[PDB]
Amino acid sequence: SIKTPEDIEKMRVAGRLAAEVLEMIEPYVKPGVSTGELDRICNDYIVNEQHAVSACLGYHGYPKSVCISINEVVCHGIPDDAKLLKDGDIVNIDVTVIKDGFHGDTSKMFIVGKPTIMGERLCRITQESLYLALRMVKPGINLREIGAAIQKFVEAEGFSVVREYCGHGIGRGFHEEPQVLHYDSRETNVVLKPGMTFTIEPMVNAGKKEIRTMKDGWTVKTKDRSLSAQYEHTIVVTDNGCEILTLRKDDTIPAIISHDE
Numbered sequence: 708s709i710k711t712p713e714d715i716e717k718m719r720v721a722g723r724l725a726a727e728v729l730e731m732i733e734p735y736v737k738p739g740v741s742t743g744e745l746d747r748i749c750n751d752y753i754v755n756e757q758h759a760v761s762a763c764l765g766y767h768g769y770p771k772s773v774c775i776s777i778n779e780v781v782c783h784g785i786p787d788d789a790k791l792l793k794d795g796d797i798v799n800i801d802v803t804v805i806k807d808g809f810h811g812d813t814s815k816m817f818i819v820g821k822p823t824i825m826g827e828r829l830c831r832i833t834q835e836s837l838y839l840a841l842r843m844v845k846p847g848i849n850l851r852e853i854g855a856a857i858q859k860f861v862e863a864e865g866f867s868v869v870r871e872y873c874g875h876g877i878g879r880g881f882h883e884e885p886q887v888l889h890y891d892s893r894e895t896n897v898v899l900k901p902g903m904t905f906t907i908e909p910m911v912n913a914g915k916k917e918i919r920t921m922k923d924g925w926t927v928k929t930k931d932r933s934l935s936a937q938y939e940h941t942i943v944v945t946d947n948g949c950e951i952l953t954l955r956k957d958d959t960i961p962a963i964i965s966h967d968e
């Protein structure tokens with residue numbers, strides 16, 4: 708759908724809160740901490756301080772407040788008090804908050820302790836694939852072109868793109884039309900228009916693109932157990948570009964990307 712200025716302002720607030728959770732949890736992602744603990748810290752912050760609520764909790768039965776995925780886990784990892792972080796781990800924390808009826812969805816990678824060279828490389832390329840997509844967003848561009856650009860870049864840098872999970876429209880609903888694929892698909896044909904709000908959240912594997920879903924029905928892993936990274940931002944298409952609603956202080960791209968001269 709097409710969001711109104713009123714809707715957009717509310718999404719700015721929800722997006723900002725979601726981003727602030729990631730900025731807050733940052734210093735706690737250390738060797739020795741459990742993902743279950745990281746989840747409690749995030750949830751307490753969201754409920755007690757932001758006076759908001761996690762959109763993940765209860766969604767199709769999801770048991771926790773945030774998704775935390777480690778190394779070969781592609782996405783939707785479930786926080787667990789028994790799972791401790793250790794040196795070298797690459798960790799994605801995916802946050803989705805609901806405030807004033809609107810959603811804000813974002814995630815970023817964190818490397819624990821001493822980084823591994825390929826670990827740093829994978830995360831770097833993944834974030835750049837997101838940035839590349841974001842600098843492309845403007846009315847007139849087709850989602851298929853965006854997905855094609857992401858895939859071309861990722862593959863050009865020696866990695867693979869996960870096909871089964873994608874970005875999505877977002878607003879008063881967690882997942883709304885359209886689907887935002889991170890690769891070139893014949894199924895995709897959507898011309899962007901101002902007012903559309905959606906996410907871009909490429910999942911990149913160091914090895915092959917194939918994945919597998921665990922018995923819990925949530926945890927997704929790379930079929931070859933290679934590392935997988937992901938970054939996500941929620942945006943709104945503007946008259947001549949886009950505006951990132953979940954920008955953080957550490958992002959190396961501005962909130963508003965305009966294509967004017």
Ligand SMILES: CCCC[C@H](N)P(=O)(O)O
Pocket residue numbers: 762763764766769774782783801802803812872908939
């Ligand atoms: C708890 C369900 C997972 C929802 C994730 N934020 P996404 O749909 O962006 O992977």
Ligand SMILES: [Mn+2]
Pocket residue numbers: 801802803812813814908939
């Ligand atoms: Mn997400």
Ligand SMILES: [Mn+2]
Pocket residue numbers: 812813874875906908939
């Ligand atoms: Mn999402």
Ligand code: NA
Pocket residue numbers: 776777778779780781782797799934935936
């Ligand atoms: Na991973």
